[PDB]
Amino acid sequence: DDFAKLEEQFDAKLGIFALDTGTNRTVAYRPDERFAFASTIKALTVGVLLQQKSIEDLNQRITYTRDDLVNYNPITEKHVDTGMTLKELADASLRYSDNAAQNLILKQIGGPESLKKELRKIGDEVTNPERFAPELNEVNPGETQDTSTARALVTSLRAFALEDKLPSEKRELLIDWMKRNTTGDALIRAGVPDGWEVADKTGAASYGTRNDIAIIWPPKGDPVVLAVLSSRDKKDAKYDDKLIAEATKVVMKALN
């Protein structure tokens, strides 16, 4: 009802899945409903890159041209003459949601098709990577390309960051980057109590899609993995971040 209330208030569709790793307690609402993943895919992409290379390989300097720049290149646009290391690219991608950075990384792993194979490998038969950025943001209802589910996103995020798809030191790199994200202050971070550390990755796409996936650490205890996906019934519809913050509060209460 609390979740229904939010859909009413914001005129949006909500997709939620939360798992308490400490008790295996779960919170779900439209858990298996498909939504464009948007930029949330950036986190899964780095997970794959990390698996593919050694910490040292990350120091490889990548040279690019103005031709590699897309619509949003906050960091990337400033280093076209010098090039950027894989490590630096991953930083740009996760912390600033740099689009060119995402594309550069994707190219390094073999493209969307390669990424897909790797996700399948980890046991994720839901996530559907197919395009580069920003076109991946263009999804119409019914379409399945560049989509996923709340349950699938948390399952996959958890695999790479908390489980055995990556060794400890690589897991650490990923978590640090995510913890220091600069784009999610008004989302999941806003619906969490004072003192709890958050690692998150946001996304925004067509049909007023607004997403946030994270891992939350209580003062003392095992982390909580959560996905909050949302969409609206109009192509040019805008989104309201308050939806995410409020939905988060409901989850905490439901788990607390």
Does residue 39 have an active-site annotation? yes
Does residue 156 have an active-site annotation? no
User: Cβ atoms within 10 A of the Cβ of 77, count?
Assistant: 14
Angstrom distance (rounded) from CA 171 to CA 183:
21
Q: Which residues make Cβ contacts (< 8 Å) with residue 80, sequence separation at least 6?
A: 64, 65, 66, 69
Q: Which among 7, 8, 33, 39 is annotated as catalytic?
A: 39
End-to-end CA distance of the chain: 17
User: Cβ atoms within 10 A of the Cβ of 125, count?
Assistant: 9
Please state the residue numbers annotated as binding site for substrate. Answer: 201-203
Task: Collapse the DSSP code of 53 into the 3-class scheme (helix H, G, I; strand E, B; otherwise coil) and give the result.
Answer: coil
Please state the residue numbers annotated as binding site. Answer: 201-203
Q: Which among 113, 135, 143, 163 is annotated as catalytic?
A: 135
Q: Considering the domain 1-256 in this protein, what is its CATH number?
A: 3.40.710.10
In this structure, the strands spanning 209-217 and 197-205 are antiparallel
- Rg (alpha carbons) of the chain, rounded to whole number: 17
Angstrom distance (rounded) from CA 186 to CA 105:
27
Sequence ranges of the domains in the chain = 1-256
DSSP H or E stretch at residue 30: none
Structure-solving method: X-ray
